[PDB]
Design an enzyme around this catalytic site. Structure first.
Site, PDB file in Angstrom:
ATOM      1  N   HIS A  43       0.693  -0.982  -0.003  1.00 18.48           N
ATOM      2  CA  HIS A  43       0.033  -0.095   0.172  1.00 18.48           C
ATOM      3  C   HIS A  43       0.843   1.343   0.193  1.00 18.48           C
ATOM      4  O   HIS A  43       1.970   1.225   0.274  1.00 18.48           O
ATOM      5  CB  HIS A  43      -1.128  -0.047   1.349  1.00 18.48           C
ATOM      6  CG  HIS A  43      -0.486   0.440   2.441  1.00 18.48           C
ATOM      7  ND1 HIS A  43      -1.058   1.137   3.378  1.00 18.48           N
ATOM      8  CD2 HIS A  43       0.708   0.167   3.199  1.00 18.48           C
ATOM      9  CE1 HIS A  43      -0.391   1.229   4.289  1.00 18.48           C
ATOM     10  NE2 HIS A  43       0.792   0.600   4.286  1.00 18.48           N
ATOM     11  N   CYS A  97       3.707   5.218   5.419  1.00 20.60           N
ATOM     12  CA  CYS A  97       3.761   4.199   6.027  1.00 20.60           C
ATOM     13  C   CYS A  97       5.197   3.875   6.134  1.00 20.60           C
ATOM     14  O   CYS A  97       5.882   3.891   5.133  1.00 20.60           O
ATOM     15  CB  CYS A  97       2.935   3.098   5.882  1.00 20.60           C
ATOM     16  SG  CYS A  97       2.985   1.457   6.493  1.00 20.60           S
ATOM     17  N   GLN A 115      -7.116  -2.653   9.696  1.00 19.46           N
ATOM     18  CA  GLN A 115      -8.132  -2.093   9.719  1.00 19.46           C
ATOM     19  C   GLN A 115      -9.212  -2.385   9.156  1.00 19.46           C
ATOM     20  O   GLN A 115      -9.095  -2.667   7.586  1.00 19.46           O
ATOM     21  CB  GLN A 115      -7.990  -0.450   9.655  1.00 19.46           C
ATOM     22  CG  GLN A 115      -6.952  -0.141  10.926  1.00 19.46           C
ATOM     23  CD  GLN A 115      -6.137   1.325  10.140  1.00 19.46           C
ATOM     24  OE1 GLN A 115      -6.422   1.974  11.192  1.00 19.46           O
ATOM     25  NE2 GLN A 115      -5.375   1.158   9.383  1.00 19.46           N
ATOM     26  N   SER A 138      -6.000   5.551   9.782  1.00 16.63           N
ATOM     27  CA  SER A 138      -4.598   5.990   9.608  1.00 16.63           C
ATOM     28  C   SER A 138      -4.567   7.198   8.532  1.00 16.63           C
ATOM     29  O   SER A 138      -3.522   7.932   8.748  1.00 16.63           O
ATOM     30  CB  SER A 138      -3.788   4.797   8.796  1.00 16.63           C
ATOM     31  OG  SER A 138      -3.925   3.645   9.685  1.00 16.63           O
ATOM     32  N   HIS A 141      -5.182   5.107   1.754  1.00 17.83           N
ATOM     33  CA  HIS A 141      -4.562   4.286   1.284  1.00 17.83           C
ATOM     34  C   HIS A 141      -4.877   4.039  -0.374  1.00 17.83           C
ATOM     35  O   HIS A 141      -5.974   3.996  -0.916  1.00 17.83           O
ATOM     36  CB  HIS A 141      -5.051   2.829   1.841  1.00 17.83           C
ATOM     37  CG  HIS A 141      -4.792   2.791   3.271  1.00 17.83           C
ATOM     38  ND1 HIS A 141      -3.619   2.562   4.210  1.00 17.83           N
ATOM     39  CD2 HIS A 141      -5.641   3.327   4.325  1.00 17.83           C
ATOM     40  CE1 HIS A 141      -3.818   2.564   5.477  1.00 17.83           C
ATOM     41  NE2 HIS A 141      -4.960   3.016   5.571  1.00 17.83           N
TER      42      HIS A 141
HETATM   43  O1  LIG Z   1       6.261  -5.752   5.618  1.00 18.61           O
HETATM   44  C1  LIG Z   1       5.782  -4.544   6.250  1.00 18.61           C
HETATM   45  C2  LIG Z   1       6.939  -3.623   6.712  1.00 18.61           C
HETATM   46  C3  LIG Z   1       7.990  -3.506   6.137  1.00 18.61           C
HETATM   47  C4  LIG Z   1       8.955  -2.724   6.552  1.00 18.61           C
HETATM   48  C5  LIG Z   1       8.742  -1.636   7.693  1.00 18.61           C
HETATM   49  C6  LIG Z   1       7.105  -1.688   8.084  1.00 18.61           C
HETATM   50  C7  LIG Z   1       6.356  -2.694   7.665  1.00 18.61           C
HETATM   51  O2  LIG Z   1       4.953  -2.498   8.202  1.00 18.61           O
HETATM   52  C8  LIG Z   1       4.669  -1.530   8.809  1.00 18.61           C
HETATM   53  C9  LIG Z   1       5.884  -1.044   9.811  1.00 18.61           C
HETATM   54  O3  LIG Z   1       6.830  -0.758   9.046  1.00 18.61           O
END
Ligand SMILES: OCc1cccc2c1OCCO2
EC number: 5.2.1.8
Length: 147
Positions: A43, A97, A115, A138, A141
């Site tokens: 995402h 993110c 969510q 959040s 997305h």
């Molecule tokens: O595979 C998901 C992922 C990969 C790398 C960092 C991340 C993350 O998820 C949210 C938190 O930070």
């Protein structure tokens, strides 16, 4: 008639029918094609000032409005759909993110972990399909179902 959550609509500007999915917010000209324990999704998140945690690796204090966040989301979707940019590229550069570091990949997940709007869109997407703007606490997305 149509897969989960699709309905016919009419282009205001062209008058040509198109199809809209009210679970994923995807829209397309073609009639939509054709559930698993798990899906894998990437995402791109754009946060706004009402995000649950209005902070990210990109900005210590996220101050953009939710309308502004939606315009950014819409602009990314246009460039992804035109092929000017790749989803993975835009996610790496602009997702609020920290999964930006993984080209937006979240790995695989079941129902009940994400969510609910994100989960419902993720599971309604067909493999390879991308959502429209999907709203959660959040932010907004763009979701790409990879598996
Ligand atoms: O595979 C998901 C992922 C990969 C790398 C960092 C991340 C993350 O998820 C949210 C938190 O930070």
């Amino acid at each position: 008639k149509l897969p989960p959550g699709w309905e016919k609509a009419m282009s205001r500007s062209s008058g040509r029918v198109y199809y809209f999915n009210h679970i994923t917010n995807a829209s397309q000209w073609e009639r939509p094609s054709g559930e698993p324990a798990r899906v894998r999704c990437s995402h791109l998140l754009v946060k706004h000032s009402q995000s649950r945690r209005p902070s990210s690796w990109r900005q210590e204090k996220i101050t953009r409005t939710k309308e502004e966040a939606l315009e950014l989301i819409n602009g990314y979707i246009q460039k992804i759909k035109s092929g000017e940019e790749d989803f993975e590229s835009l996610a790496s550069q602009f997702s609020d993110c920290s999964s930006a570091k993984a080209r937006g990949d979240l790995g695989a997940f079941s129902r009940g972990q994400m969510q609910k709007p994100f989960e419902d869109a993720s599971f309604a997407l067909r493999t390879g399909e991308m959502s429209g703007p999907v709203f959660t606490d959040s932010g907004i997305h763009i979701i790409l179902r990879t598996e």
